[PDB]
Amino acid sequence: QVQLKESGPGLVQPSQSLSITCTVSGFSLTTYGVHWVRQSPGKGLEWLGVIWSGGSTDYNAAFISRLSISKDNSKSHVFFKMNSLQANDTAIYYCARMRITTDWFAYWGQGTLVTVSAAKTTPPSVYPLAPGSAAQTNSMVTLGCLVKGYFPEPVTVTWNSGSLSSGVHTFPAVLQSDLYTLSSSVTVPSSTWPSETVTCNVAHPASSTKVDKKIVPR
């Protein structure tokens, strides 16, 4: 089958270069061109460039000064290379077959998430979110866990190990200065808290951190 395997860094320093290698199988680079596309929440999908089968290139005008695509036909390798990355170059990068003519010989690479940052590995601070002293008791009670100031992604959050699955929402991280923050909420029957324990389990494999935080009334 057609396959596009990508290999490259998950993380790049500000002002350093990004190199991704797309390794192709199922079709020949002498016959087909390969495009490069990136994706960010802000910009949607963004076409960056193409290396045609005859070996000429074309580039998005906004990247011409810092982007080069090249290849090795015999090794089925396409090389994407971009200089001077900054925060707004954070995106998922894809090699892909596009402008297609055929039923069949058309795929996209899996995609390489690239974050551009100088932040060091940093464990999260974990804070419990218990309802305020003067909160109303209502038949369900919602608790939470604030996971603050970590880098890089990801963290995982569970509640009572795997015990509490239902009524959980763990929200996507957002950058706060150079560091990530997220929170997780869990909703249980009022009768059963604080009488039964509720503990959020936070893991940050990058820093080898595991923290349990028991949610106790104020």
Place this chain on the structure above:
Amino acid sequence: DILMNQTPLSLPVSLGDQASISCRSSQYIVHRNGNTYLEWYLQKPGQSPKLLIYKVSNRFSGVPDRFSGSGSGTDFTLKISRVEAEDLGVYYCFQGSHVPYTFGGGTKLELKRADAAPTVSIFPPSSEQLTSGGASVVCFLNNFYPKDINVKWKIDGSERQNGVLNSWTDQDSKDSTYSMSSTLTLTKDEYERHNSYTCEATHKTSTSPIVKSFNRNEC
């Protein structure tokens, strides 16, 4: 560059419904070597975009016949005759006629469900956080529909924007609702200059906002 305008931005549908997505280019999509390169992609959460339709109307292998592409010039349409679960995701048009090649902004095909009000909960800063000289006030707005929502923070009656960070969840695969967190970060010192902290959610399920607050001096 050629702007590709996709509409609608989101398209709520029930299963079984027809669906129609439009794509408009800012200039005529001309042939190259006799081929008019207008493509539609479907992206599902966490996966790469997959090709549905190539060359305007041509159905890529493995794509079922409930999908159809049509149009010419500056006006193109993707139709789904009878929507199934697996069709949900974000659809994109793409033109390969004029360099630089360009994608539409995306149309998110989503599940329709009964409207639901957000369950709002506010949380003062923890004492552990206060010890570190930081103060985060967290608001959860959970299990609402539709997805359009507005959150506003007030501090002793005054609106407050700086130091606010929001995060939205994807549509839930089971109950089809959305959820959101809103977090107001302050210094301890600033947190203690004020008494009343309010989290206001405006949502279509009411003309009045949902208000949740606490007074620092009663905690």
